[PDB]
Write a protein that binds this ligand. Structure first.
Ligand code: MG
Ligand code: MG
Ligand code: ZN
Lengths: 151, 184, 37, 63, 133
RNA sequence: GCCAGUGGCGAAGGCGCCCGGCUGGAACGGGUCCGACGGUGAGGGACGAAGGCCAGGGGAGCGAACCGGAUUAGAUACCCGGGUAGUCCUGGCUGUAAAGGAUGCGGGCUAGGUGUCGGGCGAGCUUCGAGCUCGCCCGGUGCCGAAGGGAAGCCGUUAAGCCCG
């Protein structure tokens, strides 16, 4: 899914099997699963990393299957969900680090293009999240404000 | 200048090669043969034809009288041998390293290995690291003399073929060149 | 310029590079006698 | 009907026990993180580009 | 006058061979004292004939007999086609000259194509399209 | 340089000595997260070979212009000898190319075979090697090819086929 700026037909990904009900081999209930989610967010892990750890260590496939809820739903219930969304945050951190690189390296135009594409993605997601309310309407990407944000 | 005022100034190799006569140069005013250089194909120790391709360059140092004694300047492998080595569907991994021996001789060592097949750049640089590590430790633990002897021999190349067979199988590693830079 | 591969062919033509160069010389003369002389 | 209809995982969840504590623990065969025993901190599977390399499963199951 | 038991005096014949001339040049084992240097253009008067294996053998014979007069029972061979941006093939004069030396009777030792090959390349002549002759 | 390839990376232009540092993007694996956020894009912007220009440096080789030697009926050329700008660096402008896959981008369908690069899986072998061989999956890059298409050449699951934009 290099699509969107590279147009390679990559198919790497997950293959969730159709599951109307949770697996019987699973030990944990919805409640303790939620507790683990909250524990790991306090340990400082993003939701993606939380699902990864619960898949690899605790053998939990699809917190959604188990609890009926999503990880970010659990986080916002326990008052721990991130202020701005994670994917946007990640892009912004990338862009800031790259801004720094490019100030010390002005002739790296290929990395400059990578920055341009990164900020394009940012703008797209900002548009969508303004439209859906996950950001204020007046929110807008800016490099310096984003630097303060990350920091 | 006529050629009859010339005296033949027999030329001897260094000590650690066995101070054999490696030839004789004509000259007058023996200051004229100081910087001169002789190349020989390890016919110093020609009890082996395994090494007819190893050209050793010595340089006259301190002629005494009708006896010109030399120093080791470097060695190279013969272009014939190298062009036999480097083929297609075959990989060439060279490494050029500056090393100070235990006794302060500075050398540039251009070693090389030949992997059987077309391999990855990461493997190539792993082997380059192997070469670097072997050469560096040999240099810091050995002196100029036995180092050079190893290298004009093949103990080092053999260690390198071994200790790099673990990255990829190897076909006839070598050391390919040494040149001296300094001799404190 | 806008160019034409058709013009680049040579079946009944002069070479396009040189046609082009002629055109540009003419244009230069015209520009020259237009603005200042 | 085969191999693209209902694309199904090749990976498996599998039950292992550590050699040190012996606690049975479910894990994933293709982990992105080094999996540690919940009791001892021992690595049960070390991550790779694909199927993780398994330590400490001498009594094993797979679901 | 060192007491020479062997009379196996060895020199070096540097043979510059090209498509326009050939130069035999015999020296001591070092290469810093010259003993014979003969060219196609010495041995003939036609420029077009300078490169030929004919007149290469003659230059080789004269240089050989001069050297084996002066001692020098044997010669190593270093044949040299022109430089890096120029041609890298010697010519016929090379093999012709070594055959001539063997005929003259000098013990031919080890031979080597000592041709300077570049690992980079300066720009060669002719321009982008070469010699359109 | 040889290695160096219907090889690889890159939007294209383009990118080859090694080492270290900063950095971009992709593939694979993924019961990870978000939850349609997507496509195309008028206008608009960025990048953009060589060459050229401004300024400042450098200048080995090559070398437009020019200068000489030949050739020729002539020779404002081809050949030879030299040679200025330029080619290199710094910062800017220029914004053109047979910039070509002469093939806009996305998505679905329509036999495959055989290579090769990368990742993965499974087997076997091993000098137990980031190793070798076989097969399978994904993604790239090629050749061939039935049907099909086409004026034909040729294309042919990397369509120049059918459909959706
Ligand atoms: Mg057309
Ligand atoms: Mg065909
Ligand atoms: Zn344990």
């Amino acid at each position: 899914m290099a699509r969107m700026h590279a147009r390679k037909r990559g198919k790497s990904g997950s293959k969730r099997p159709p599951r109307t009900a949770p697996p019987t081999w699973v030990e944990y209930t919805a409640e303790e699963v939620e507790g683990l989610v909250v524990k790991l967010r306090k340990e400082g892990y993003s939701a993606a990393m939380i699902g990864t750890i619960l898949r690899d260590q605790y053998g939990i496939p699809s917190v959604k299957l188990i609890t009926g809820k999503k990880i970010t739903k659990i986080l916002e219930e326990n008052g721990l969900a991130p202020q701005i969304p994670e994917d946007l945050m990640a892009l912004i951190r990338k862009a800031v680090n790259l801004r720094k690189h490019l100030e010390m390296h002005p002739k790296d135009r290929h990395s400059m293009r990578g920055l341009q594409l990164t900020e394009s993605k940012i703008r797209r997601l900002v548009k969508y999240y303004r439209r859906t309310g996950k950001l204020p309407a007046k929110w807008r990407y800016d490099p310096e404000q984003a630097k303060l944000l990350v920091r | 200048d006529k050629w009859k005022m010339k005296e033949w100034y027999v030329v001897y190799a260094p000590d650690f090669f066995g101070s054999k006569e490696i030839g004789l140069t004509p000259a007058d005013e023996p200051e004229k043969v100081i910087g001169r250089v002789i190349e020989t194909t390890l016919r110093d120790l020609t009890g082996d034809f395994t090494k007819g391709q190893v050209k050793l360059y010595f340089q006259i140092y301190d002629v005494k009288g009708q006896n010109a004694y030399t120093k080791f300047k470097g060695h190279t492998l013969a272009r014939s041998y190298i062009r036999s080595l480097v083929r297609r569907r075959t990989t060439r991994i060279d490494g050029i390293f500056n090393v100070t021996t235990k006794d302060g001789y500075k050398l540039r060592v251009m070693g090389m290995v030949i992997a059987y097949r077309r391999i990855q750049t990461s493997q190539e640089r792993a082997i380059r690291e192997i070469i670097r590590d072997i050469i560096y430790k040999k240099a810091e633990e050995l002196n100029y003399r036995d180092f050079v002897l190893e290298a004009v021999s093949g103990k080092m190349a053999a260690e390198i073929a071994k200790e790099a067979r673990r990255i990829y199988p190897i076909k006839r590693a070598e050391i390919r060149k040494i040149k001296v830079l300094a001799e404190p | 310029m806008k160019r034409r591969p058709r013009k680049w062919k040579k079946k009944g033509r002069m070479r396009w590079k040189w046609i082009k160069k002629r055109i540009r010389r003419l244009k230069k003369q015209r520009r020259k006698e237009r603005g200042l002389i | 009907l085969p191999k693209n209809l209902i694309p199904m995982p090749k990976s498996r969840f599998l039950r292992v026990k550590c050699i040190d504590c012996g606690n049975e623990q479910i894990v994933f065969s293709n982990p992105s993180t080094t999996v540690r025993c919940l009791v001892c901190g021992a690595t049960l599977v070390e991550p790779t580009g694909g199927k993780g390399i398994l330590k400490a499963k001498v009594l094993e199951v797979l679901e | 006058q060192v007491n020479l038991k062997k009379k196996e005096k060895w020199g070096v014949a540097h043979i510059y061979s090209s498509y326009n001339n050939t130069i035999i040049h015999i020296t001591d084992l070092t290469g810093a004292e010259t003993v014979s240097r003969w060219s196609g253009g010495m041995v003939v008067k036609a420029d077009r004939d300078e490169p030929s294996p004919y007149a290469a053998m003659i230059a080789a014979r004269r240089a050989a007999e001069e050297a084996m007069e002066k001692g020098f029972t044997g010669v190593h061979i270093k044949v040299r086609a022109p430089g890096g941006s120029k041609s890298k093939s010697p010519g016929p004069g090379a093999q012709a000259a070594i055959r001539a030396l063997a005929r003259a009777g000098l013990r031919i030792g080890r031979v080597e194509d000592v041709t300077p090959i570049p690992h980079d390349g300066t720009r060669p002549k002719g321009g982008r399209r070469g010699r359109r002759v």
